[PDB]
Design a protein around this ligand. Structure first.
Ligand SMILES: [Zn+2]
Ligand SMILES: [Zn+2]
Ligand SMILES: [Zn+2]
Ligand SMILES: [Zn+2]
Ligand SMILES: [Zn+2]
Ligand SMILES: [Zn+2]
Length: 233
């Protein structure tokens, strides 16, 4: 309990609320074209890919560079965090009708890195770090909440149940944010390590979520918009 965790809970809350707004838009839409779905998901992926680079790895290296020094030991700390983040998510991807439940688990697992990244990115209190990432994550949460609800409906839930499950799915960002503050505030190196870890987890999820032309337009737009947000915020 402290100041920099509050900003993280607020970040996690904006992630849950953004997901929910996207989820509630499916009530009115019920179905969308494959062109629209593929673009949205490519936009969501592109936002998190650049976020991993510009909001997590690059700030984590700077944080490590002032805790440890300018040498490669700083970069080593982050890279090792990154590899541990991949392997944590490689693990979960492996150790885990009633097919709905298995799709729901994926949706849950894929929200975990975004929640964690919000909580990690606010550990030092720097709005210049947490704000671009949190607002990028909320932005792609709207398409993702919509996408999730429509897909749960496409697999056979009535839109109302599907929207409900989608909204509950978003609770994983508040929860992941709590996890993120925990792993980044134990010791000095916890922060750069946890920045690498969230980036790695994030990159694993988005590799697993990447009509290729329409998806590329979304991918490029999400990437470019992430660069804009990081530069402006
Ligand atoms: Zn996402
Ligand atoms: Zn050195
Ligand atoms: Zn998976
Ligand atoms: Zn897999
Ligand atoms: Zn997914
Ligand atoms: Zn497609």
């Amino acid at each position: 309990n402290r100041v920099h965790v509050g900003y993280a809970v607020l970040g996690g809350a904006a992630g849950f609320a953004a997901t929910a707004l996207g989820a509630l838009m499916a009530l009115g839409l019920r179905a969308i074209s494959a062109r629209t779905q593929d673009a949205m998901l490519g936009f969501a992926a592109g936002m998190m890919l650049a976020a991993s680079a510009f909001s997590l790895i690059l700030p984590g290296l700077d944080a490590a560079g002032t805790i440890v020094g300018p040498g490669p030991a700083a970069a080593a700390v982050v890279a090792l965090g990154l590899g541990l983040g991949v392997l944590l998510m490689l693990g979960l991807d492996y150790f885990t009708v009633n097919r709905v439940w298995l799709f729901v688990l994926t949706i849950i697992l894929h929200n975990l890195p975004e929640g964690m990244a919000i909580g990690v990115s606010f550990a030092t209190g720097d709005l210049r770090i947490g704000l671009p990432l949190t607002s990028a994550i909320a932005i792609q949460d709207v398409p993702e909440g919509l996408a999730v609800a429509l897909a749960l409906r496409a697999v056979g839930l009535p839109i109302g149940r599907a929207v409900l499950v989608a909204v509950a799915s978003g609770l994983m960002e508040p929860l992941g944010a709590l996890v993120g503050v925990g792993i980044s505030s134990g010791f000095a190196l916890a922060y750069p390590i946890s920045m690498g870890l969230a980036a790695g987890a994030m990159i694993f999820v988005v590799s697993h979520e990447v009509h290729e032309t329409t998806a590329t337009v979304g991918l490029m737009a999400g990437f470019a918009l992430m660069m804009f947000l990081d530069t402006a915020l």
